[PDB]
Design a protein around this nucleic acid. Structure first.
Ligand code: MG
Ligand code: MG
Length: 803
RNA sequence: UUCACAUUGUU
RNA sequence: AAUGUGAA
């Protein structure tokens, strides 16, 4: 239950395609790097400050110690050659315009062993070596650019990309060192993010408060303005030589604001001590440093410090500007990455030079294979077969495999009548019934109930009435004016309080209908009512379907940044037929920002029981798609969760041991794939075609992983999903697993398109999202409360309410 | 809330 | 959540 299976073989299905990857081959010497531990006192210093300290230590003690070491920013120092220190732990006094730095030799890192690991010779890739290489490649840019995670950012020279509110777009790149079947690879991608302008605080005030000039406000500021500004600058760093974090903004103007020196004002203090007359004394001051102290600084003497990323949310306009700034088609992105790498000068990096490393300035050529899409089987009387072309198909002249006959339904319109009239509702009903009839989901008549309502308060009593009054009620269609807290309430009542099927529609989609919109809407409706939209062509499925098999999807969605308290949400879905089409859901609230699904065993047990209830089979196989786990958590996650699945099986039945395949689905990596041949590009975005598969050259040297871009690239540059097999009792071959995954990408019911991840994982996402909606504004006893919030009604348990 | 894709995620 | 590109 510990180590990931070796790659069984290489895929052979599908026609070849020439690709380029944003992986750049690295030359690594055979020598041994030497690793030393570093302890810096005081120990609370920022990583930047630590790097500065070590740099200064090397420059001040260059004599008879040390030539060019690299530092990870905390406790790790690597050197290409040994240091005249042996294993001795020495204490160095470093004074920087006060720091005690102890150096103890830890170990040796053999790059030769890494060469053994990249070949077949060594079973595993030694992580210490990878980390060493990463510290090497990260040393220089960490002190030249602004490090953000594994990326680096900078103010692009010659360009200004203002966002408003004292913010601008900084451009940069993700850089990571990764082992491959081929060589060591430098993964390089371009990115952009919001940073605070390094402008005077006065101009920051002007941009925040919308002043063209500071003279627009000659008064001391309204409380609204002072608060609006306080919320913007609080937490940011300003300077005068001296760095300060802004903890507050004084209420009183600099002329009036006082402090004890006996009391003295700020304006006066800057007159007497600094010979400074304040040109804007009517404006307030910034309280900096410790908030228990009384250090107040005028706005005029302060600048926003450069290199501070905007953590706060961007406004709608700032976001629009951001997207316009960073919108790149696939070829445009390929060229920007290439331009970046050619101008990067990695091989002239003195620290890269010290460790004898060479980096190839060209993208790696890779051969992909474009898998054939599955045929999609429909129902009705004509039993049409749809053939996905470039990851897309449609439902024109097609009927659902199993269409629900709708006899009893209602309409609840929370939109104002003056905006969404009865005529609109009637026309909408006619159109929807036409489309529904075409799709094989006949809405046989008019709704038995159609009334207007207002506010969330009216939801529960209206729904309670509906459930009491109309026997055999199948659906309530809820018309919403737009973004409103009524949606969350309709879902709370419907899914968790009364167990009623709802379908919400925006007012604008009722006022102006299109065949396509109504079609997709009919997809959702048919699914919610227990229907089967379509199935994979039975004879076109891989042989895994010859025995009972269940498909599980799992995801943990986490609370937004700058948060605590809000729980993480874990969602697991399971297939309930042989198609596979129908799914059931399980969802739990859990510890804040925990990736490991805590209650997995119980969830899986539920899903297995329900599977048996639906199919009268016990799965001989369990295929588990696990979204969002990064490499650094493979071991922990697999250890807990695999054992959880096994436990769920054992407790269900003595000696019930279905084979488990554990795949990690990853969409948030930095691997990009591009068409080498321009004539292979698809659409306006110029992306690789749906079905593109890569399991060579840039993948793992020993393990079972692959890239599958299962979706059509509509806009920007596609993200090919990465699949990493952490465990496989079923002994899948690459071909069968890749084809299975791809086919699963075609079973997603909310659209007639192949999606970017297999339907189970996507459904898991939808479930966690709905749970987020159930928990809106609700976040021992509190865990019980939150658990209750996400617990769906009994009549909702066997449904696809999350569609 | 029709949907997918993509982006931001010592004063 | 925001913002874009699109679809029978
Ligand atoms: Mg997740
Ligand atoms: Mg959106």
């Amino acid at each position: 239950a510990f180590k990931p299976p070796p790659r069984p073989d290489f895929g052979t299905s599908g026609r070849t395609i020439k690709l380029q990857a944003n992986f750049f081959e690295m030359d690594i010497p055979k020598i041994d790097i030497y690793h030393y531990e570093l302890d810096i006192k005081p120990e609370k210093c920022p990583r930047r400050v630590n790097r500065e300290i070590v740099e200064h230590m090397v420059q001040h003690f260059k004599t008879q110690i040390f030539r060019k070491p690299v530092f990870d920013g905390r406790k790790n120092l690597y050197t290409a050659m040994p240091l005249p220190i042996g294993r001795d732990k020495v204490e160095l006094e470093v004074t920087l315009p006060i720091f005690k730095v102890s150096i103890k030799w830890v170990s040796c890192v053999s790059l030769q062993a890494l060469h053994d690991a990249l070949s077949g010779r060594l079973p595993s890739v030694p992580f210490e070596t990878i980390q060493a290489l990463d510290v090497v490649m990260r040393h220089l840019p960490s002190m030249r650019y602004t490090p953000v995670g594994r990326s680096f950012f900078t103010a692009s020279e010659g360009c200004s990309n203002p966002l408003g509110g004292g913010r601008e777009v900084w451009f940069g790149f993700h850089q990571s060192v990764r082992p491959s079947l081929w060589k060591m690879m430098l993964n390089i991608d371009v990115s952009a993010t919001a940073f605070y302008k390094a402008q005077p605080v006065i101009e920051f005030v002007c941009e925040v408060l919308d002043f063209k000039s500071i003279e627009e406000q000659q008064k001391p500021l309204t409380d609204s303005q002072r608060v609006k500004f306080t919320k913007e600058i609080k937490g940011l760093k300003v300077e005068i030589k001296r760095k300060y974090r802004v903890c507050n903004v004084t209420r009183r103007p600099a002329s009036h604001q006082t402090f004890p020196l006996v009391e003295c004002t700020v304006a006066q203090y800057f007159k007497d001590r600094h010979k400074l007359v304040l040109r804007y004394p009517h404006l307030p001051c910034l309280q900096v440093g410790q908030e228990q102290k009384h250090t107040y600084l005028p706005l005029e003497v302060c600048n926003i410090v450069a290199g501070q990323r905007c953590i706060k949310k961007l406004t709608d306009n700032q976001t629009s500007t951001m997207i316009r700034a960073t919108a790149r088609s696939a070829p445009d992105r390929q060229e920007e990455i290439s331009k970046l790498m050619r101008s990067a000068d990695f091989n002239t990096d003195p620290y890269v030079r010290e460790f004898g490393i060479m980096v190839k300035d060209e993208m790696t050529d890779v051969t992909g294979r474009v898998l054939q899409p599955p045929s999609i089987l429909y129902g009705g009387r004509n039993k049409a077969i749809a053939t996905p072309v470039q990851g897309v198909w449609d439902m024109r002249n097609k009927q659902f495999h199993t269409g629900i006959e709708i006899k009893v339904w209602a309409i609840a319109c929370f939109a104002p009548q003056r905006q969404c009239t009865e005529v609109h509702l009637k026309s909408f009903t006619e159109q929807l019934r036409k489309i529904s009839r075409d799709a094989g989901m006949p809405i046989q008549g008019q709704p038995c109930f159609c009334k207007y309502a207002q506010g969330a308060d009216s939801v529960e009593p209206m729904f309670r009435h509906l459930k009491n009054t109309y026997a055999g009620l199948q659906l309530v269609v809820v018309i919403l004016p737009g973004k409103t807290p009524v949606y969350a309430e309709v879902k709370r009542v419907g899914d968790t309080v009364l167990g009623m099927a709802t379908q919400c529609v925006q007012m604008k989609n009722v006022q102006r209908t299109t065949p396509q919109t109504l079609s997709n809407l009919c997809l959702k409706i048919n699914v919610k009512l227990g229907g089967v939209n379509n199935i994979l062509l039975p004879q076109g499925r891989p042989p895994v379907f010859q025995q009972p098999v269940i498909f599980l999807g799992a995801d943990v969605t986490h609370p937004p940044a700058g948060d605590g308290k809000k729980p993480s949400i874990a969602a697991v879905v399971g297939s309930m037929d042989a198609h596979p089409n129908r799914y059931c859901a399980t969802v739990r609230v859990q510890q804040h920002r925990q990736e490991i699904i805590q209650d997995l065993a119980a969830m899986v047990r539920e899903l297995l029981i329900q599977f048996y209830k639906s199919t009268r089979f016990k799965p001989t196989r369990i295929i588990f798609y696990r979204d969002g786990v990064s490499e650094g958590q493979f071991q922990q996650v697999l250890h807990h969760e695999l054992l959880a699945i096994r436990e769920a099986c054992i407790k269900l039945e003595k000696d019930y041991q279905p084979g488990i395949t554990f795949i990690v689905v990853q969409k948030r990596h930095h691997t990009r794939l591009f068409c080498t041949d321009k004539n292979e590009r698809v659409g306006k975005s110029g992306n690789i075609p749906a079905g593109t598969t890569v399991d060579t050259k840039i993948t793992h040297p020993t393990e079972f992983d692959f890239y599958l871009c299962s979706h059509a690239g509509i806009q920007g540059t596609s993200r090919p999903s990465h699949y990493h097999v952490l465990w496989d009792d079923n002994r899948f071959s690459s071909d069968e697993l890749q084809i299975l995954t791809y086919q699963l990408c075609h079973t997603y019911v909310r659209c007639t398109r192949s999606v970017s991840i297999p339907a189970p994982a996507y459904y898991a996402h939808l479930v966690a999202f709905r749970a987020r909606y159930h928990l809106v504004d609700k976040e021992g006893r509190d865990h019980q409360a939150l658990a209750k919030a996400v617990q769906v009604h009994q009549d909702t348990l066997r449904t696809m309410y999350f569609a």
